[PDB]
Amino acid sequence: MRECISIHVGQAGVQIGNACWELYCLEHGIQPDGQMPSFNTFFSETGAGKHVPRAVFVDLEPTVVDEVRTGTYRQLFHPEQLITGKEDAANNYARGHYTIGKEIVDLVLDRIRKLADLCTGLQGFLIFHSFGGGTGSGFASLLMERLSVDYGKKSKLEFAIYPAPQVSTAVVEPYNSILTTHTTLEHSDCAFMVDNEAIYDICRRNLDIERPTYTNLNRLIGQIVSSITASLRFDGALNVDLTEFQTNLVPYPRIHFPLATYAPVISAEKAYHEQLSVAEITNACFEPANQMVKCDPRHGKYMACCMLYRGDVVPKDVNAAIATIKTKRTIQFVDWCPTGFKVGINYQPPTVVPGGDLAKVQRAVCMLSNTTAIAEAWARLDHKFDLMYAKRAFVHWYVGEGMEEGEFSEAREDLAALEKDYEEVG
Amino acid sequence: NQDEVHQNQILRELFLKELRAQKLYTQYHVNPLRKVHTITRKPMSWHDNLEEPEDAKFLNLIHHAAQGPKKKYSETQTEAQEIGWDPNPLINPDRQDHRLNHFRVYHDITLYKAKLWS
Amino acid sequence: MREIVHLQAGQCGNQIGAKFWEVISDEHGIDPTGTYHGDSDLQLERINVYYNEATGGKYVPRAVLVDLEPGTMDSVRSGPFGQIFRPDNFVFGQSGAGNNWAKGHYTEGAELVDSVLDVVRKEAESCDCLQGFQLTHSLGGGTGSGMGTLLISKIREEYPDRIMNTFSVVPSPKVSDTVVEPYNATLSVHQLVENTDETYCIDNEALYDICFRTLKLTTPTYGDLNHLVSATMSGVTTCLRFPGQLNADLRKLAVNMVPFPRLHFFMPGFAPLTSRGSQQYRALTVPELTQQMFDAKNMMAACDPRHGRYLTVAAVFRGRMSMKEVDEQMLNVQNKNSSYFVEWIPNNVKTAVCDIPPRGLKMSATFIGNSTAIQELFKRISEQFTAMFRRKAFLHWYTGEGMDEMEFTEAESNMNDLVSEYQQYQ
Amino acid sequence: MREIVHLQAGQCGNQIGAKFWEVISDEHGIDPTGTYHGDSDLQLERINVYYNEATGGKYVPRAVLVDLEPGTMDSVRSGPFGQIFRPDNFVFGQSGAGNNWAKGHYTEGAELVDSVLDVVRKEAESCDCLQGFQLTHSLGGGTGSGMGTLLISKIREEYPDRIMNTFSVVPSPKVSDTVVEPYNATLSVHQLVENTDETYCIDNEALYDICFRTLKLTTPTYGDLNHLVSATMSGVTTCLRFPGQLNADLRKLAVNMVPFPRLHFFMPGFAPLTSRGSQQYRALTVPELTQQMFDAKNMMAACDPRHGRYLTVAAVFRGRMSMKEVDEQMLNVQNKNSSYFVEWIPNNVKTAVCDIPPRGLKMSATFIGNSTAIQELFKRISEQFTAMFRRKAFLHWYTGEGMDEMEFTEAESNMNDLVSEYQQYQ
Ligand SMILES: Nc1nc2c(ncn2[C@@H]2O[C@H](COP(=O)(O)OP(=O)(O)OP(=O)(O)O)[C@@H](O)[C@H]2O)c(=O)[nH]1
């Protein structure tokens, strides 16, 4: 029976997991204790009749997880599941990959091993982290590396923060970002790269909230993950599992980087005054100004599009919207995909948290396009890392940590080769 | 050389100075509400079964500490605790009505199949 | 867990730390007796960072006070927060240095190096996992400028990996108090470059400047001057002691502040400084925080950054905000005054958020920045040290203690090489 | 059942045992009349270890006081617990030894042995099952160092299997008050090595050192020094008199601390020494007691264990704790100071716990150990004894008592042989 295990790493992983888990609890009706006054894909029953989240929060700093430990859901969560470290990497991939990992690699591996023992038929491993933090980078790299040989066939979804092209919370982020990409290339099945700046622009423009926060962002991340998992959780006319939409997204072993989009995202006051229907929501999913990654697909060509409707929706309207979007010259397709859509429908509308921002809306849409327009962000990162490595700044930190400096040039060349492959597809 | 005949009375002068400046602890026993360390007794030792009274406010301290933030504070304090602050569902969860709240939780022969997979 | 030991040297250091320990004790709700009288739970959640537990609900300073004269010790004991310190941590020697670097470093130093080393060691083995020590001292003294270097040199051999901040007070050329001041300064920076992870350049003349204009105080005492620097360092570790939306610590900025090991000198900046006539006519906003933050008059050092290039910038925010303004104001600054930032490091700014506001205040920020303007100080020291050394004046004081002559030559050579590799990075 | 008789020789021994009976009577709740005024049942269960029953519910100490001079006992009878003693147990001569070892061992000795041997015989036959005798004296006396050697020589013949302990006082070179003090000690240690199961090498000089630094008492009298030892013999016998989680007795310690019969000289210690200023700033914890103990300033003899190898160590604790922090600090100190422990004996240390704390205190710890540093004591005496004996100075006082000059040579050979094999075991 379908099961998805959370392997969230870092401060981003902890906050995003707490978000996603309040949405899972409100969706399944579970009280903050863990008692019910569908669920089994995420929860698990106990002798006491409680429901156990199948999440592994791992961090190198205590306080980020102790906030959860003294949070509301303390009795809901497992003291053993929450894995903490005493000293962090402090935005150092080398620290995160070579010096501090091996202390708790075994503990994290044992925790996910017992969770997989509890699960009967494992569908997927949803793994959340960031490309900026030394923890969320190096630890994610090593756990992908060991998890690949621990489970060869089990699918590993990779949700991760990518550094924003303009704003940044770190200076030493590009070194970790270039050194991490090897694991998301050779140890990942799907990757869901996200930069904060895009969601910042979206929530300012559409949601009318002039002063949002990380929990406002995490609300939409939980929403998109929930819409991904809704077909597994509840019934649909065309249920879509993980295997189906990875097969109809990944043409080659080297191309597993789709871009996502959620529609409709409007506040309640503006939601008062418009019809929300299939055509409008699928047109909003295609606007370059609504894309959650800072790139224009109009500068590239779509070669795959996974599609997840939700709520009150009819396949007649789905096919009409597909015809309408196909009849558009601004939207391009590569020559080797006359048919490049993967349509799924689910019955239950997306639920709403109190204190959130999106209004309750009867029909929603999640779009996952694999295109070639993402490579320009990697090109920007390549220029930034090149002018980093030209003067060999911050190299002494990693060298004292103990890695070999040729790996930097190797990672740069590897990402250049990935961009070249994307050019060959394009 | 260390002229201890002078040095010791320099130390005596100092000891008298912080003796004048010495202030006693004001007998305000505070304890961390985080955790305390304890030692298990011997159940049979004919001194260990001695009846002795407990404290009445410490129990209130734990019963207040081991509880969520909402009943602790009238208003929020940190942005990490805005999250899940109000668990009140704005409409009643009529989760028994299959008409509008269709659920795919395991039903009918699929429960037996979950048993049969083992 | 993450504990800080405050090593204390010099009359300037003793008075700075005494006021520094007062604000944190006030910040953590600590009475002169030593108990806890505050209200919030988070006031004691990371209290043990600076304090050690004693019986009866007592918290003791983890400070080691060092001075070569008994006269400072009675004064710090006679303060309102005077008895709160542990008497066994107090260490002193019978004879001073008379503002002589040579006497403190070599002659009278060797008799008191042992005793302080045991005291810091007992505090070192007390805490389970220490992040690193902490020292505040003055570069114009005989103990803090002299003796104080010898502590740093020894503890780096004993504890290499630990973080080492020093809040050294650099003497001013416009306002100086010692004739042999350049000799102590020249022989201390060479010890400072070799063994120090980060340095904070604080000057009393600039501290005199702000209270003249920013605060408009009629009679600024040295206690007021100690109030700012204590407020500065309270903003450095507030993210360490309290959780925030985006967390940080000393290792977070130090990795992100040092492109090359030869540089570790930074510029401290404090936000919420307004005079009595400025309180009535103002709107407390994050943009109002940033405009005073970058203004060259708010700084507490004797260098104008507009004459140089800003290498890296840190802005740690204290209180509750929304980062959109924080990100937009950082982005706004990084684009307008583009000439003052280096080109080989895009996104020079590092930001952090600590949710807990400072006591008695709501909005605050601390600025740490490495700019090319710090070489304005060392060369200004050089034009006096060479003007002291060519005629061998005031040399018999230093020659009589037992050293030869090339130590001055290697000291000026190292600082000349330091500024020389520093001009090349401009 | 398990009885110990206390032998009391010399003015040093008479005053030490007088305060020794004072503190343990407080521990057993005995008034100066002799009755029981205590509260706990456990205060009177094993009181017959040291006391003999008398009609009317009175208890008499099982002690024999011997001194060649009648003057000292008049002060003893004039003390607070003076009338407590049985008058018949007082045996005394008319003329003192004049600090002459030979007068007392030989000349004035033969008359007073008959009376004291009778009294100890009556007390030995009074008890059904005697563990053994204990003697308190000084090695610089005429009676304790003199007579006292002949008593143990005789009673070993009478009672070979019974254990005897001697808390003898070893003279110090830094402060001495007798010319022939080496001469008496030279002829006393030879009697100790032949007939003694365990010796507690106490020294006056460290006792004044401790009250000057650790207690900081301005005017330390002989009572405070006698109080310090009084805690030491109380801590030896607390596990015998009172039950604990892990019980022990003197034979538990005698067997486990003598690797070879020639080595029975040991180093006592007793932990909770805090000055009045130190009472405010502490946390009563098991680690605090251990760190205080293994530092050499706590030690009450005249030689540093850092210059030798700890052969055997034992730590007897008073109070109700748990043994893990007892065992982990036990394991921690064994691993850390590895060089100071011998290699041919793994697990060099022995532990015991007695539940009942000392009166008026919560925690007390007693250490009794064998270290190579005790050979520093014997060789220092030989540095003096040969200097006097080379010129035959102060010899006619001894030679007038009728013994040969060979006795100095055979004695001098004995500890020279002792320190030789003691050096061999290092
Ligand atoms: N979207 C989102 N991103 C976050 C969140 N928390 C941290 N991040 C990102 O993570 C990056 C830094 O890494 P952190 O997550 O803070 O910490 P880490 O992953 O444990 O790595 P280290 O800092 O080295 O310990 C920042 O640049 C943020 O962009 C979050 O709650 N939501």
Ligand SMILES: Nc1nc2c(ncn2[C@@H]2O[C@H](COP(=O)(O)OP(=O)(O)O)[C@@H](O)[C@H]2O)c(=O)[nH]1
């Ligand atoms: N900012 C500041 N500077 C101080 C204070 N007290 C002393 N100083 C400076 O310290 C210098 C003297 O230091 P000194 O006592 O010789 O240092 P020491 O030799 O290490 O003890 C003077 O030049 C003062 O400018 C203070 O409270 N605040």
Ligand SMILES: Nc1nc2c(ncn2[C@@H]2O[C@H](COP(=O)(O)OP(=O)(O)O)[C@@H](O)[C@H]2O)c(=O)[nH]1
């Ligand atoms: N620790 C301690 N030593 C003492 C005390 N009284 C005397 N002494 C020591 O005993 C020595 C003199 O002993 P003495 O009277 O000749 O012993 P006797 O010949 O056996 O009677 C002196 O050197 C003192 O140091 C005391 O109360 N405590």
Ligand SMILES: [Mg+2]
């Ligand atoms: Mg982190």
